[PDB]
Amino acid sequence: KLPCRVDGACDATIIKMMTDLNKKGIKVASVGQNYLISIPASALFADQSPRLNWASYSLLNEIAAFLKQFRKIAITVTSYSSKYVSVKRERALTLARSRVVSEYLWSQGVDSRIIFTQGLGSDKPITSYTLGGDRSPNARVEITFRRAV
Amino acid sequence: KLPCRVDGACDATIIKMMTDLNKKGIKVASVGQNYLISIPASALFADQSPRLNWASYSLLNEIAAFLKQFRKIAITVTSYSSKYVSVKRERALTLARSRVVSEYLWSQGVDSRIIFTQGLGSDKPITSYTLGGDRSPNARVEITFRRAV
Amino acid sequence: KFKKPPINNPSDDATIKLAEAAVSVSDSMLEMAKVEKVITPPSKDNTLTIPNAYNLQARASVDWSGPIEELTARIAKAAHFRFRVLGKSPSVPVLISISTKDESLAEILRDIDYQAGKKASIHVYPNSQVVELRYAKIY
Amino acid sequence: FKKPPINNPSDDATIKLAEAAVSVSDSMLEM
Amino acid sequence: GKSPSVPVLISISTKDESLAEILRDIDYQAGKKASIHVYPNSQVVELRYAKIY
Amino acid sequence: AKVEKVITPPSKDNTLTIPNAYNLQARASVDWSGPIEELTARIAKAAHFRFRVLGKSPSVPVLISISTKDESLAEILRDIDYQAGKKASIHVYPNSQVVELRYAK
Amino acid sequence: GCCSKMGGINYCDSSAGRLVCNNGFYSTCYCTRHAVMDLQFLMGCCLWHGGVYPQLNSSGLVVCNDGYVSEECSLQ
Amino acid sequence: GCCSKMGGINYCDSSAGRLVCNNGFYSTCYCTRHAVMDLQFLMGCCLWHGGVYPQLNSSGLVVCNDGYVSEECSLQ
Amino acid sequence: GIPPSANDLLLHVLEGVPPPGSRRLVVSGGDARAWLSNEKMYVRTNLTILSPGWLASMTSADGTHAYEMQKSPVLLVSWHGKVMQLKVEGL
Amino acid sequence: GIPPSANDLLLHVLEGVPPPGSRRLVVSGGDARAWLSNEKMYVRTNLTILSPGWLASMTSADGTHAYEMQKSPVLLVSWHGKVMQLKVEGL
Amino acid sequence: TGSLAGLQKETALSVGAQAGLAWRAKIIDEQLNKQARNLDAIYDFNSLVLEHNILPPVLLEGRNTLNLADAQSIRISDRTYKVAKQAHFITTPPTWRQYLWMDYVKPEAPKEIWCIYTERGWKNGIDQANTILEENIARIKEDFGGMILYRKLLAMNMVSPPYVSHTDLGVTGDGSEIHIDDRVLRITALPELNVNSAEWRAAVAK
Amino acid sequence: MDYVKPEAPKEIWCIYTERGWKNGIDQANTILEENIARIKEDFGGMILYRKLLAMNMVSPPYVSH
Amino acid sequence: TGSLAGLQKETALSVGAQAGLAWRA
Amino acid sequence: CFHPPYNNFQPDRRAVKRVGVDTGGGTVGLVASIYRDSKRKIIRDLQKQDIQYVEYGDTRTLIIPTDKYFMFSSPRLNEICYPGLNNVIRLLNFYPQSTIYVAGFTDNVGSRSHKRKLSQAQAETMMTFLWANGIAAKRLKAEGYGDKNAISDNAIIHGSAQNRRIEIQWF
């Protein structure tokens, strides 16, 4: 009569969606009990504007369906961009992008208690090759969490 | 319901191990209740260095399998070498050799309470023919014990 | 393929429960030892009573769970020193438990002297080559 | 060929139990 | 201060709000039992319990 | 809740500030539940200050409870002064290195 | 199959009440009853009272341990 | 076969509790019950108490000589 | 009339030793233990109990709670800011 | 009042003579003898008894020990620095 | 039973549990025997014994205590200390085998739905043995923690040490039996908590 | 409300079974309505105390420690 | 008795003793 | 051939033995050599042993468990697990210009100074083994952290087992 597992979850489904996301291009990483999802900004937003495309909601639905498989307390969403005009415009742009992404993720049914949103601008690059705009690999959105128990 | 012998031991196995070690070249001697195993240093170590060869671990496993056949309290490992540079280097080399041999023996499962290690350098030779180096018969390691009950 | 590095042998829940008890025992002992060391700072060390010399630097690996006198006699016999006993042995025996690996005989004697506590003491005279075990003036 | 120790903590609970025993023995020695 | 034996319980359900506003709502809901102070020059968030019981 | 809650301004907050004397940033671990005088004397000894008391002890002593694993001595003194309440106060003079426990009249 | 598309079940970790598979991943299956289950629906009557008082009754009434009478378990 | 690959059993030395072969080697076999055995596993219940108290019980409970009740040998 | 201080049996409940003469209860859905001695439940857990109400309480040094309360087949707990239920059998 | 000095049966236990009216017990696993006289167990051996605890003790000149203790089907002994067990039957 | 359209064994459970209990007890005893030296290192009762071979007392601690005795009145406390067991003379130190060793006796006293109920009883017996082992671990942990707590409160000067008086008689006895050196030892003051809070000593660890 | 699964069980059978099926649903709705009225009375009675305390018609409780 | 899959004279003793006792005596 | 204790710290002539034994084809041996000398085959071999490889941006990290690559509670290196260490050297041979950081991490059991000293000793041992295979000393730095920034939960058995590790980062 007692449940035998956490509901709506399966390890084969988890491995399948990690494999599909890694083949699609969204980076999924797991070290210990920490999980990281890295998304390029060109697959979600327009050219340096905080407006989502209409076709990126399918990718956001896939990310939400992956996120429903775990049990968790807090999610961190961080945005990074590249240098366009000044520091104020890019920090405001990254904050707006993180706000929109976290709003859609909270609208979908993830069972988390706290979601934190921040945008760091262009302070922490991951690649020294900085010739592109939003096509650069260091313009991204990162979703980090820890699996609980 | 009571045991009929000491476990993992047999007199036929003891005689077979003694005969095989004596044919291989490791000297096994028994006078009264005292037992002595004499090993040349060239079959274990390199040319006057405290580094074991990789192929001597099979011989060390054979010696450990012979040593598991008895009941004992204290074992003594004593090292002897030849004249190379000075007495300090010989004493340190013999102490290091006895330390490594007893460390591997204690890592294996001998059921003894105390293992004593000493290296005497070149103070006690058994043969007046001292022309060789580590190939001399008076460069050796000795493992002595007494069978208990 | 997705894997994480530590993959050991399967565990038993009895050993899991024993480890869960032992960790809390260990940090309770850590708190008690810190409090006792802060309250009472020691000022003397037994290196003065037990000094080292030549042929006390032979080494030993020992696992002993019995009385002190036989083990001390074996250490003295391996160190080629005479063995002396002072005082009356108590009717309740002084038990020690040593489980070490590859340390010097002087360090083994110092650990035995520390574990003996207020019941027995170990002294070493290297000029006469004598190891002496003395019992406490109690009872 | 080299062999591992037969009484080796190859289990993730036995490792924790053994290092807890080591810390308890060190604390007793300090006391 | 000392934590009370009866715990101080709060219930927060917001969406897209700043941390200062969240801390202010937590301080208002705690009320007379606990207080929240923020020192930005030392970067310290301090929670103090009431001098009661 | 906005109507019922009463606050105090930070200008007139009667709480001891951090004295920022260099000997008082040493970390410590304290487990204590008892009188204030003995713990304050040991905190002064660990901070290499002097310790003095002005006032008289009541019939019922002032009881505090400090249980921390890694905290500065100034923060410990601030927590002690907060837990003392209106009955006692702790003053720190760093020029002549002394701490003062003052009772309420 | 709990640890499907993996190396299979390694062991039950009772400290977390979860299975550990042959990789380094925790499984979603439970293996002890003292695991964190999000239970929201519980059966039985005289809930949020002391429970069912164990007397045998001539009538069909069900009485709780605090004197309350459960109309749902009572026979009409 | 105790003294195998030797000359056979000479006699039982009861002062040590061991057999002597026809050479001068001690045998690994025991020949008395007062021999040094490394016994670490002992059967029976109410161990580390006074033993099983010999009363006959209407129920299936097993009581030890120190007042303890052994749950393992008790019948459910 | 001075009220009684506490029940000293909650020290043994904190240490995890069951009270003498009691019988065990089965707790499902979370990490908790329960015993029944004198038509009162004694609960050892590190969660927070919200709905049913307890009579006496103690806390250990590492954060383990001990409760004395009346018998009930359901407990409402808060785990990490999330409210769930524990089911008690054997009453 | 002054406590009693000892029990004088332990001199005969040290000498190896059983007390009168007692019955024999079977001891396996080591060199020890045991007797039961008045619901008490008398053990003659030269080993060191560690776990079960004894009530009275004497020692001879050559190193033989005599113990007066309660009855128990198991004894824990130290032989030469190694801890082992002795099994007592006939109780 | 459900919708309106819907409206319109014990002996196997008994015999599985004893075999499961005995098998799990044997496996637990084997796992206890695998770690004999580590348990002796952890639960080392021998080095906590006092000067005159006296076992230290067991002390219990409680923090943040509340009692609702009745409506309109409550009683609270910050900390409480209790003496659970008292000090006494010992001849032997305790060991972990008197606490943790489980009792094993081989049971040699013995189909459509038989197997499922037999395996259900098997799981029930395994769970019962695990519960018994958990209770034994808690029972030894309580005594060892109390013995550590006594030394810590003795360091912070809240308990009194025991006091030992010894009487040294000479050569006593009659002409039929003599004793050479009689010594009578008696402890006169049991350890106890003190209530004078002005004598307590605090500890600050740098 | 309390739920226990009942597992303890034709010309004119169906219509009267349907009538009883309606009657049970009506009874459950009445029970839920009474529970809602009870919790509403308790909460409104607790609000009225705060309003009359602000309007100064009741006395606050007094605590001595 | 053992595993779950496993689940799924006196007069001679009398008469030997006196003969052994007399022979050993 | 190959000497099992570290091949006397010499560069192993691995390809010539295979292309000399695969003749009694040279092209088949060359195909096998160019397959087994690839970076992805080395990554899959390190996946067959218990060593994790993480690449993100231009920073690469190797995670090695001390419970299987060290002796118990000692800074001694376990010599039975030498193919994993040789594969680490083979993978690190592909980047001759980057700097190397090695860090040691333990669990929460023990004292703080004991944890720091054990992590520092294991980090120095791993850095010395990296230095002795040809890597210059100015490209290396070792650090031992305690239970400071763990990656799992220390209150559970498997999570506490996952925290004892050696991390090697390069650019």
Short mmCIF file of N, CA and C in Angstrom, two decimals, chain C residues 8-12 14-16 18-19 22, chain D residues 7-22, chain K residues 31 34-35 38 42, chain N residues 67 72 157 164:
data_model
loop_
_atom_site.label_atom_id
_atom_site.label_comp_id
_atom_site.label_asym_id
_atom_site.label_seq_id
_atom_site.Cartn_x
_atom_site.Cartn_y
_atom_site.Cartn_z
N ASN C 8 32.40 0.86 -4.81
CA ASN C 8 33.04 -0.11 -3.95
C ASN C 8 32.20 -1.38 -3.87
N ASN C 9 32.59 -2.28 -2.96
CA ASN C 9 31.80 -3.47 -2.69
C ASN C 9 30.49 -3.09 -1.99
N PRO C 10 29.45 -3.91 -2.12
CA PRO C 10 28.18 -3.61 -1.43
C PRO C 10 28.32 -3.67 0.08
N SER C 11 27.54 -2.82 0.75
CA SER C 11 27.63 -2.61 2.19
C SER C 11 26.53 -3.34 2.93
N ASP C 12 26.72 -3.47 4.24
CA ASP C 12 25.75 -4.09 5.13
C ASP C 12 25.20 -3.05 6.10
N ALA C 14 24.14 -3.38 9.12
CA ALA C 14 24.74 -3.48 10.45
C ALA C 14 26.00 -2.64 10.55
N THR C 15 26.87 -2.72 9.53
CA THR C 15 28.07 -1.90 9.49
C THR C 15 27.72 -0.42 9.33
N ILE C 16 26.64 -0.12 8.60
CA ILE C 16 26.17 1.26 8.46
C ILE C 16 25.76 1.84 9.81
N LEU C 18 26.70 0.73 12.80
CA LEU C 18 27.89 0.82 13.64
C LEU C 18 28.73 2.05 13.31
N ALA C 19 28.85 2.38 12.02
CA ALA C 19 29.57 3.59 11.62
C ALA C 19 28.84 4.86 12.08
N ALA C 22 29.65 5.24 15.63
CA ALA C 22 31.06 5.50 15.89
C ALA C 22 31.46 6.93 15.56
N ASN D 7 42.38 -8.07 5.06
CA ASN D 7 41.51 -7.30 5.94
C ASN D 7 41.54 -5.82 5.57
N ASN D 8 41.21 -5.55 4.31
CA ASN D 8 41.25 -4.17 3.84
C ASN D 8 39.85 -3.57 3.81
N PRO D 9 39.70 -2.31 4.21
CA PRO D 9 38.39 -1.66 4.11
C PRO D 9 38.04 -1.31 2.67
N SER D 10 37.50 -2.28 1.94
CA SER D 10 37.03 -2.07 0.58
C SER D 10 35.54 -1.74 0.52
N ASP D 11 34.95 -1.40 1.66
CA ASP D 11 33.53 -1.07 1.76
C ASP D 11 33.39 0.32 2.37
N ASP D 12 32.42 1.08 1.84
CA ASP D 12 32.31 2.49 2.19
C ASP D 12 31.77 2.74 3.60
N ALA D 13 31.21 1.73 4.25
CA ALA D 13 30.89 1.83 5.67
C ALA D 13 32.05 1.39 6.56
N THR D 14 32.80 0.38 6.12
CA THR D 14 33.96 -0.09 6.87
C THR D 14 35.07 0.96 6.89
N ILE D 15 35.20 1.75 5.82
CA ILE D 15 36.17 2.84 5.78
C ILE D 15 35.85 3.87 6.86
N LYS D 16 34.57 4.26 6.95
CA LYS D 16 34.14 5.24 7.95
C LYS D 16 34.29 4.70 9.37
N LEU D 17 33.96 3.42 9.57
CA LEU D 17 34.12 2.79 10.88
C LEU D 17 35.59 2.75 11.31
N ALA D 18 36.49 2.43 10.37
CA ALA D 18 37.91 2.32 10.70
C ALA D 18 38.53 3.69 10.97
N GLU D 19 38.16 4.72 10.20
CA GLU D 19 38.73 6.04 10.49
C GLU D 19 38.13 6.65 11.76
N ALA D 20 36.88 6.29 12.09
CA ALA D 20 36.33 6.68 13.39
C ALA D 20 37.08 6.02 14.53
N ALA D 21 37.44 4.74 14.37
CA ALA D 21 38.25 4.05 15.38
C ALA D 21 39.63 4.68 15.52
N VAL D 22 40.23 5.09 14.40
CA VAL D 22 41.54 5.76 14.42
C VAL D 22 41.45 7.09 15.18
N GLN K 31 29.17 -10.55 10.91
CA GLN K 31 29.63 -9.19 10.65
C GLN K 31 30.22 -8.54 11.90
N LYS K 34 33.72 -9.97 12.19
CA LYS K 34 34.68 -9.42 11.23
C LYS K 34 35.37 -8.15 11.74
N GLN K 35 34.71 -7.39 12.62
CA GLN K 35 35.25 -6.11 13.06
C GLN K 35 35.51 -6.10 14.56
N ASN K 38 38.29 -3.22 15.76
CA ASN K 38 37.79 -1.85 15.64
C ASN K 38 36.77 -1.53 16.73
N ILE K 42 36.98 1.37 19.53
CA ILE K 42 35.95 2.39 19.69
C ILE K 42 35.39 2.38 21.11
N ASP N 67 40.04 6.38 -2.15
CA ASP N 67 39.68 5.09 -1.58
C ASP N 67 40.13 3.91 -2.44
N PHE N 72 45.06 2.88 2.66
CA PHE N 72 44.08 3.35 3.63
C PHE N 72 44.71 4.29 4.65
N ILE N 157 25.98 7.60 3.67
CA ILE N 157 27.16 6.76 3.50
C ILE N 157 27.76 6.93 2.10
N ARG N 164 35.66 12.01 -0.80
CA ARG N 164 37.10 11.81 -0.65
C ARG N 164 37.71 11.65 -2.04
#
